[PDB]
Amino acid sequence: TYKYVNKKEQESEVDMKSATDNAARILMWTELIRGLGMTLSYLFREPATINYPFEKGPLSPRFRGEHALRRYPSGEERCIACKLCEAICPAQAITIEAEPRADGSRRTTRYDIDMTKCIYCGFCQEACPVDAIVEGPNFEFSTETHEELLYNKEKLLNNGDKWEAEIAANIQADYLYR
Amino acid sequence: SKVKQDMPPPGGYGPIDYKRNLPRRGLSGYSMFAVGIGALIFGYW
């Protein structure tokens, strides 16, 4: 079905009262006055402005922020150097090198994420089979040089150690959906 | 357990207005022309 947005049906003819109403509308600027009144109502409303940085906009546990590498509760790294995140990364922002550790464990020797190349899509955290790489909810990590956004394994493990109290709670609140 | 999912309430959601709703306000043209002419005459006197 369809409807007309501007087509008028029949005519209203001509009347002295209607002509006087249109004359008053043209001369006394009635629609302009009611536009003024609308802006006046908005003036006397309450603004929708939060007091940043003391107030923050609401988010969800699903929010994709700064990357981090998590651990098991024992303290062992969750990552097993399987390169699924590297394979699924649409921007090729992940570089992984690996070798057996001194105890024979399958661990990374290089895990780099170019955050200037990353598109913050969460494909790494949804392809990780052991929940090692995550996008924790940090978003206020802007730097002053281009280099500081080239994360390596030490930076990502430090982020995982810093944000574990929040990332674990978000994964607890979210993991039944995924 | 029971399947829990994001679903509408069993009674459905309430009616959502969507039509164009202008207040259709203001006084008549005769009345405001009469007010203006009366103001003119009083000011002239």
Added chain:
Amino acid sequence: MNLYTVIFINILLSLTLILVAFWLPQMNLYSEKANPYECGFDPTSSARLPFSMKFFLVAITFLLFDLEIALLLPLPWAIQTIKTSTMMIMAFILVTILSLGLAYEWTQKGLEWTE
């Protein structure tokens, strides 16, 4: 004397403001800094080229109408005359002639812009 003094004070104030605005901040100007602005690209042609005017007839009419304004402006002293009938008739004739000229130009589409 007082009006001349306050005009000179305004002149001195604005000259002082523009002088401190030009001599206070650090200067660093080069060729790309002082090239003209054309939304990021080089200008195709100079801005001193002829630039067509679509309201030239309205501007000439504005000259004539401004002189009609100059004629109408001694009215607040003209209304003090003894022979108010002659003044009233002459003012009515002047305003009616001006209105007839405006109506004729509106009819002949002179107020409309070319192209």
Added chain:
Amino acid sequence: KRPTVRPRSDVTHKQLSAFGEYVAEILPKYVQQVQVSCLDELEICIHPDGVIPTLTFLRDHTNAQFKSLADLTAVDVPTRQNRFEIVYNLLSLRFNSRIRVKTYADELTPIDSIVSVHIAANWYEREVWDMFGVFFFNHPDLRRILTDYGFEGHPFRKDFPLTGYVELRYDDEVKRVVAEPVELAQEFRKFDLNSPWEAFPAYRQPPE
């Protein structure tokens, strides 16, 4: 019935097959192949000489009325003699249908532009020339539309590298934005994401 498989209607397939027979018998001088996909889409593969008559007939015929050109594009298959397959997707609002017209070209045989048939073909053929190097005859103004000014090569070709040949940087000695041969801090790592096992037996090509 099956929740994971797309439902299939045979009426659209029958109608498109009938219309393909109709167009093929109307224009045997240019039509080389007519096919209907299992996705219920009609494709008519024509000789490059018949682009103007075929497009004009499809736009202006009473039973066709394909008055809207959806898009015009090219596909680079660099294993045939005529590597560029020019594709016209057209929409008939009168009959609520869509058709696809294909033709072929190589780097040195231009095809006729259809700006006189559809005006959108102007920018579409500009894009095709800019991205593939397929020249168009009788175009009102054929030039690049998406590449940089002075860009050399047609980047949507298969043999053109992904990163290109030049990169821009601001040189302070000349105070300009200059082009250099491309050097990458990290090379694009290509992946061999092809299973060595056949996935679709219906598309098994016979051995050579």
Added chain:
Amino acid sequence: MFFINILTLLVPILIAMAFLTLVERKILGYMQLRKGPNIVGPYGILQPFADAMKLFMKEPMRPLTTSMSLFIIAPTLSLTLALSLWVPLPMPHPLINLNLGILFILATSSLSVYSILWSGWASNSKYSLFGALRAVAQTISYEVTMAIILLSVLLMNGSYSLQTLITTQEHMWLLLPAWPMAMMWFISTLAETNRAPFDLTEGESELVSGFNVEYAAGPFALFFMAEYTNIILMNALTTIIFLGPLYYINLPELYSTNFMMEALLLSSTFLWIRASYPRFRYDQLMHLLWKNFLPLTLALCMWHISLPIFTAGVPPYM
């Protein structure tokens, strides 16, 4: 003592201009469901000083194609004419008492238009040329209509002085006898001050910045000060002419307070209008002022020629 009077006129007008910029930011924000500046200072009251200091410590632009002499001359001319237009206003006693006050106002306004034109031509840029030509068309339309409006109003008043306007509105506002030409005068002041919907010279969306698109820092600050001082000026002129404040011989402070309140209300109405309406097209502004305002203005001018004659209410010479 006269120099002290010059100071106590000029400096408070400049501070009122800067806080007019602040109050425009606040009022536009609160009409746009936001807050506006409240960080820089207690309630944003240090924001204009921050902006002024930043602009006067940023380097100015001297483009290669630009005529330096007129480029320098135009903004200082604009600021001087703004303050000169401020000088003869009576509140209820003017600093400079003139006989042909509104003629001085008209001459100084047209010279401010020339400041805009010379800025646009000196800044050798196409957007500046566009701004200059739009200024030409705008001032053509509002000049003819506003001149006839002011002629009719002062024909009702009887003289070109403004203390005479105070004496005229001793008992009643001129809004009641002359409210249609009050509306047309308000629109004319909007077009004169280049406020939305009739700005059209600092065209933000149509042009980039228009006549001052090549101006930076200090001279741009001078242009902004001139424009907003003209806003307060034209609203003050409107409330002196049409909405007569209460004047008593024993105390003029009541007149100053009432004048301040009405001028603040009219300036806030200017900001309200800028929030409310979209911008005109500059040929439509000329068509409006020459096809709707001008015939009615000529008719009302004839009516105000006739009215004291047939009512015997010819105003006094003094």
Added chain:
Amino acid sequence: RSRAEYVVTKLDDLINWARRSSLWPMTFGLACCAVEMMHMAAPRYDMDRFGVVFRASPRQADVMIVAGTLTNKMAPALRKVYDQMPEPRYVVSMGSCANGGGYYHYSYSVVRGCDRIVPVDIYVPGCPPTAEALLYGILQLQRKIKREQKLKIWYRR
């Protein structure tokens, strides 16, 4: 230290306060990141409340927020409007495209980061960074230019 050193430090504080309280960006954007930039302009975050107001001409601009993919065809224009800004100017790269190419890093027609073209003061990461993150970058830039010691370095010369 010397009494004049204290006066110079206070003058530096005053100049930095003025320049960080009045930051006017150029009305310049390229993509989705510029959509988030006008969502920062939106009533929730109120850059105007922070004192940050867009100006269309680069002559009246103080900072340049490179918000989007800087292409090869766009790079001379971006360099031109950066060069036409007056001297106390700053650059805020926004999003992965302007930072280091992002999703189009290996493209033939994309400059791999706007720092190859203009000197970037502050990098804001994200695709897109939220308006919260862009506002955070603006406040970080305000702190950075609060840290500037121009008159103190001039005195120590």
